[PDB]
Amino acid sequence: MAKVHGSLARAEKPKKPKGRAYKRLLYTRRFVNVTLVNGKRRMNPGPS
Amino acid sequence: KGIVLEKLGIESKQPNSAIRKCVRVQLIKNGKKVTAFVPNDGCLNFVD
Amino acid sequence: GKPDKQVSKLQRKNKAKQLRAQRILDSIENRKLFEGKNGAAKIITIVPLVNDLDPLDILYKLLKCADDEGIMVQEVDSKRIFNVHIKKFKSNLKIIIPDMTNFLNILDCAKVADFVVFGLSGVQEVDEEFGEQIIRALELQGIASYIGVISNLSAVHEKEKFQLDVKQSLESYFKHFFPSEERVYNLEKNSDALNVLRTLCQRLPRSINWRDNRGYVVADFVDFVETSPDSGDLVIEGTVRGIGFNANRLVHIPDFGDFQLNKIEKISTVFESNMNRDTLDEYAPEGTEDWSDYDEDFEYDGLTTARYDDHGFLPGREQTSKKAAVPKGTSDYQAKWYLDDVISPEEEERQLREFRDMEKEDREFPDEIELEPSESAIERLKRYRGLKNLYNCDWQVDEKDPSSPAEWKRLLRIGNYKNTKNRIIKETKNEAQAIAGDRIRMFIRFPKFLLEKIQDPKQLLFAVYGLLLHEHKNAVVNFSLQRWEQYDKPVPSQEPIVVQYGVRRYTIQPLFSQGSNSPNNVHKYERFLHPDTVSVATCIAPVDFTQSPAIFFKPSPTDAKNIELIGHGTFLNADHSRILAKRAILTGHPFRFHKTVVTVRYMFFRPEDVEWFKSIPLFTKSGRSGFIKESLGTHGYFKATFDGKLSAQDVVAMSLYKRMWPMPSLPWNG
Amino acid sequence: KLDTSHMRYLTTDDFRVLQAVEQGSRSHEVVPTPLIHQISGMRSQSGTNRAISDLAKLSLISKMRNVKYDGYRLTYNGIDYLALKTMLNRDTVYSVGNTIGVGKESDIYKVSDKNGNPRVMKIHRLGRSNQGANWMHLSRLAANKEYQFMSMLYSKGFKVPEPFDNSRHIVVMELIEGYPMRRLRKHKNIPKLYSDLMCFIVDLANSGLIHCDFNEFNIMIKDKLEDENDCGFVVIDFPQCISIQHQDADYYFQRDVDCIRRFFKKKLKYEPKPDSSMLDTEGFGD
């Protein structure tokens, strides 16, 4: 909502990397460290 | 741009009853009345 | 019938040229209110949002960039309100600087303006508890054209490279509340100052609905004339803006009240109030004559069962033939079988803790009652009702009750608000003797003893507001009510809460309900304000016919601003038809289970009590219906039938209802 | 059978939807789901499906999913509660519950009104259920018939229960503080009561009717006072009635009379001195 005047630049859980880095993450989330669940590639599962 | 003439409670029945929270607006450049949707707003506390 | 159309080049060009010539004419007419040579009065109010900031300085900049040292020097000596005519653009400005120690004085200042300038600090970040609230509250009550301007920018680094940073961060802060603008102007530079002055002079100020539809005069000179020893005539020299004033209509003056007019003179004719005078009385004596047919005067003393006769059992008659058997010492049973014939900080803290506790209790357990064994349930709820569907059955508005307020008859019963509003506003527009842009002597009748509080029109703003028909007359009003940001605190529905709508402020003990539309106009009485959604606040207060935005607050002496801003919203309806039923839930545990009949425990403690509530439906928060059968023991256990199969984890409940009445309101001053 | 209680579980909306199925089954055989959605004049699936769930749970409707042909089936309870709802609207019945009279094509309960005046409810069950059109239709026509006969019986002075209302196959009538010829032990003026019961069959064959079955359990006798002993001879007989033109009216009439005299001979030991009225005199009397 209201960030106070102090947006003057000059004078929680872990974050996700941005840009290139993020893609890297995905490349290993899907191809270096493959997770084969129930005979399929499951993305976003809870308890199974 | 237009100016809200009247807050409309249209009711549109089948197959799904919309408690149509819509508006009668009159366009500034034509003086021409029109009906218009006001999305994502449950209470219409935004548009008087 | 009629043939068709084939518009030519010429026809087209002409219709265009006419449309645009008309547009231009109308625009000139609408831009003639500020003919800066004789008939103009552009009110600019200067509002700094930072403690360590001087408004006099902000003005100094704006008028030093007009190259007029005299008009600056002549103001330092002794003034706070100025009549400054700029020759560069030919314009008549009126500058107002508020008492920045009084919050409500700030609001009063801006709420009359055509323009609101905001002072911003390059050094000090705006306060979350004060200046921010200035922004929001101004914004809610109504603002015409606003501007964002700075003065402290030179106080930072001398190199522009760092100043522009501050400027832009301020721009993105200011954009948040006021997206209409994207440029916070810097007075340090001659260009921006010349430009903001330029705008104030030239640019036409937008309209604020409620203030423009009832007229207003900012007073320059206020004199008093003695007529009678105990009362006289306040004379007020000022220019009319808005819709204008009529001699017959009343005039409000903030922190003074509503008064009636005696004479009005123009100096750009003489009009005097005649026989069509609006009178200085709340409850009109014609309101007593309007509510003459009292329809339901039901006697709850003449009841053997709960009032629910519309959907319940039948009037059971119990003719008691009691004869006395004379064996010494004998049960009521033997006797029933012998003569049978057939034919201050501590207080606030403790109380407030208790209110928070009761509110959270009201969230976890809504409207439930806890009956004691000694408590006769019948008596304790004897006045209540027990309707099946709260939005279907036939509650009525015209019912007579000892709990109803004495004044209830004497109230202004407008049939239709939407239409009455329009009709009366058109009346006021047509019957306006004194239009906008007129200089006026206003002769108002006035009780002498209040002359002590009246200040000087140059050090303090003195505004004179118009009222419409019957606006002095009380009525049953419904407000829209929404909580102020960052306000978790509890607010019950009977405590005094000051309300500002229009310019008028009345302390109110408002009944809170949910404005959910009902076919019988009957709404649940919510003891505490809902923490998430828009609610409705109903009470007996004077009418408003322009749907003014309302500010709800509770005067707190400790805070800088001597005001705790509770909530906001709008004047919705002048309606009496809204009835409010206090619900009352009775709770009971389903003891034992048979394949169709459930024995229920701890909801009564006498069998006669169970008799009394037989017809009343039973609902379970598991979402299931049912009814009672008969009383088991001499302890109030009762057998019951239901819609589905219920376990010992469910709660069987009763809903009983009572009429809740709006409460009288008194004006608020100081 | 009939469980009147459950009716006070339904709202305006559930009756609305049940009515819609009533207009939709008298137009088409098995009313599908969209028919009920569109005819009901409702807002959404919310109200209609919730209503139908209520009706189906409370056995007022049955779900027929015949190879993609989804539809619904109004049970007898539905018709019952629609007649009863029509009467709740016409301010004729307010409470129900006491069964005296389990006939074959008629059920007799004890009811009440707004004012507390006791009455009786004769619903008609043809076939009691494998519901087609004919069962419900002919029960409806049955109570129409019997109510019209009843109205013509009250109108012309006969001591027959005053017909108050005919909600479809259901009929609201007057409760009569009476006792049948079985429960009756003795009378103060048996010849006068016989004279009455014969004059009645005379006037009935004068109207054009011959109530073929005029037995002991048929004739109710209402007492009005206990000091002065005032009697009233009520008679329940309408679908068994046989007009005065039918080929077999003769031995029907004379069976009625022979039964009157045989009971008056056995229970009260009172034989009639004047000769019994034959069919011929009453064949000229009409």
UniProtKB/Swiss-Prot annotation, chain A:
Q: What are the GO BP annotations of this UniProt entry?
A: cytoplasmic translation
Please classify the protein's predominant subcellular localization into one broad category: cytoplasm
Query: Which domain of life does this protein belong to?
Result: Eukaryota
- Span list, region Disordered: 1-22
Q: Where in the cell is it found?
A: Cytoplasm
Q: What keywords does the record list, in alphabetical order? A: Cytoplasm, Phosphoprotein, Ribonucleoprotein, Ribosomal protein
Q: Which GO terms describe its cellular component?
A: cytoplasmic stress granule; cytosol; cytosolic small ribosomal subunit
GO molecular function (one):
structural constituent of ribosome
What Pfam families does the record tag this protein with? Answer: Ribosomal_S30
Q: Which residues carry this modification: Phosphothreonine?
A: T35
Q: Does the keyword Cell inner membrane apply?
A: no
* Subunit and partners: Component of the small ribosomal subunit (SSU). Mature yeast ribosomes consist of a small (40S) and a large (60S) subunit. The 40S small subunit contains 1 molecule of ribosomal RNA (18S rRNA) and 33 different proteins (encoded by 57 genes). The large 60S subunit contains 3 rRNA molecules (25S, 5.8S and 5S rRNA) and 46 different proteins (encoded by 81 genes).
Q: What else is known?
A: Present with 37600 molecules/cell in log phase SD medium. There are 2 genes for eS30 in yeast.
The record's comment on protein family reads: Belongs to the eukaryotic ribosomal protein eS30 family.
Question: What protein name does the entry list?
Answer: Small ribosomal subunit protein eS30A
| Lineage of the species this protein comes from | Eukaryota, Fungi, Dikarya, Ascomycota, Saccharomycotina
UniProtKB/Swiss-Prot annotation, chain B:
Q: Cite the GO molecular-function annotations of the record.
A: structural constituent of ribosome
What kind of modification does the protein receive after translation? Hydroxylation at Pro-15 affects translation termination efficiency. The stereochemistry of the 3,4-dihydroxyproline has not yet been determined.
Predominant subcellular localization, coarse grouping: cytoplasm
Coiled-coil segments: none
Q: Where in the cell is it found?
A: Cytoplasm
The record places the cross-link (Glycyl lysine isopeptide (Lys-Gly) (interchain with G-Cter in ubiquitin)) at K7
Q: Can you cite a GO biological process for this protein?
A: translation
| Record annotation: effect of changing N16A | Lethal mutation
Q: Which residues carry this modification: 3,4-dihydroxyproline?
A: P15
User: What miscellaneous comment appears in this entry?
Assistant: Present with 10600 molecules/cell in log phase SD medium.
Assembly and partners?
A: Component of the small ribosomal subunit (SSU). Mature yeast ribosomes consist of a small (40S) and a large (60S) subunit. The 40S small subunit contains 1 molecule of ribosomal RNA (18S rRNA) and 33 different proteins (encoded by 57 genes). The large 60S subunit contains 3 rRNA molecules (25S, 5.8S and 5S rRNA) and 46 different proteins (encoded by 81 genes).
Its job: Component of the ribosome, a large ribonucleoprotein complex responsible for the synthesis of proteins in the cell. The small ribosomal subunit (SSU) binds messenger RNAs (mRNAs) and translates the encoded message by selecting cognate aminoacyl-transfer RNA (tRNA) molecules. The large subunit (LSU) contains the ribosomal catalytic site termed the peptidyl transferase center (PTC), which catalyzes the formation of peptide bonds, thereby polymerizing the amino acids delivered by tRNAs into a polypeptide chain.
What is the official name of this protein in its record?
A: Small ribosomal subunit protein uS12A
Note the residue range shown relative to the complete protein: 50 to 97 of 145
From Swiss-Prot, chain C:
Cite the InterPro entries for this sequence.
AARP2CN (IPR012948), Bms1/Tsr1 (IPR039761), BMS1_TSR1_C (IPR007034), G_Bms1/Tsr1_dom (IPR030387)
Q: Pfam families attached here?
A: AARP2CN, RIBIOP_C, Tsr1_G-like
GO BP, one example? endonucleolytic cleavage to generate mature 3'-end of SSU-rRNA from (SSU-rRNA, 5.8S rRNA, LSU-rRNA)
Q: Give GO terms: molecular function aspect only.
A: GTP binding; GTPase activity; ribonucleoprotein complex binding; U3 snoRNA binding
Can you supply one Gene Ontology CC term for this chain's record?
Answer: 90S preribosome
Keywords on record: Cytoplasm, Nucleus, Ribosome biogenesis
Is Nuclease included in the keywords of this UniProt record? no
Q: Does the keyword Cytoplasm apply?
A: yes
Q: Spell out the subcellular localization from the entry.
A: Cytoplasm; Nucleus, Nucleolus
The transmembrane residues are: none
* Principal subcellular localization: cytoplasm
Limits of the Bms1-type G domain = 40-206
Its annotated function is as follows: Required for 40S ribosomal subunit synthesis. Required for normal export of the pre-40S particles from the nucleus to the cytoplasm. Its subcellular location and association with pre-40S subunitshifts from mixed cytoplasm/nucleus to all nuclear in RPS19 disruptions, suggesting it acts after the ribosomal protein.
- State whether it acts alone or in a complex, and with which partners, per the record: Interacts with RIO2.
Miscellaneous note, as given in the UniProt record, is: Present with 1390 molecules/cell in log phase SD medium.
The entry sums up its family as follows: Belongs to the TRAFAC class translation factor GTPase superfamily. Bms1-like GTPase family. TSR1 subfamily.
Q: What is this protein called?
A: Ribosome biogenesis protein TSR1
Q: To which species is this protein native?
A: Saccharomyces cerevisiae (strain ATCC 204508 / S288c)
Curated annotation (Swiss-Prot), chain D:
The PTM entry states: Autophosphorylated.
Q: Does the keyword ATP-binding apply?
A: yes
Q: Name one GO biological process term.
A: maturation of SSU-rRNA from tricistronic rRNA transcript (SSU-rRNA, 5.8S rRNA, LSU-rRNA)
Q: Does the keyword Repeat apply?
A: no
Give the consequence of mutating Y194H: In RIO2-1; nuclear export of ribosomal 40S subunits impaired
- Protein location: Cytoplasm; Nucleus
Q: Which residues form the active site?
A: D213
Which GO cellular component term is one of those annotated? preribosome, small subunit precursor
The alphabetical list of record keywords is:
ATP-binding, Cytoplasm, Kinase, Magnesium, Metal-binding, Nucleotide-binding, Nucleus, Phosphoprotein, Ribosome biogenesis, Serine/threonine-protein kinase, Transferase
Q: Where does ATP bind?
A: K122
Which cofactors is this protein said to need?
Answer: Mg(2+)
Molecular function GO labels? ATP binding; metal ion binding; protein kinase activity; protein serine kinase activity; protein serine/threonine kinase activity
EC number of the protein: 2.7.11.1
Q: Where is the Protein kinase domain?
A: 94-241
Give the catalysed reaction(s), semicolon-separated: L-seryl-[protein] + ATP = O-phospho-L-seryl-[protein] + ADP + H(+); L-threonyl-[protein] + ATP = O-phospho-L-threonyl-[protein] + ADP + H(+)
- Miscellaneous notes: Present with 10300 molecules/cell in log phase SD medium.
Subunit (UniProt): Component of a late pre-40S ribosomal particle, composed of the 40S ribosomal proteins and the non-ribosomal factors DIM1, DIM2, ENP1, HRR25, LTV1, NOB1, RIO2 and TSR1.
What the record says about family reads: Belongs to the protein kinase superfamily. RIO-type Ser/Thr kinase family.
Name of the molecule in the record? Serine/threonine-protein kinase RIO2
Organism classification: Eukaryota, Fungi, Dikarya, Ascomycota, Saccharomycotina
From which residue to which, out of the full length, is covered? 2 to 302 of 425
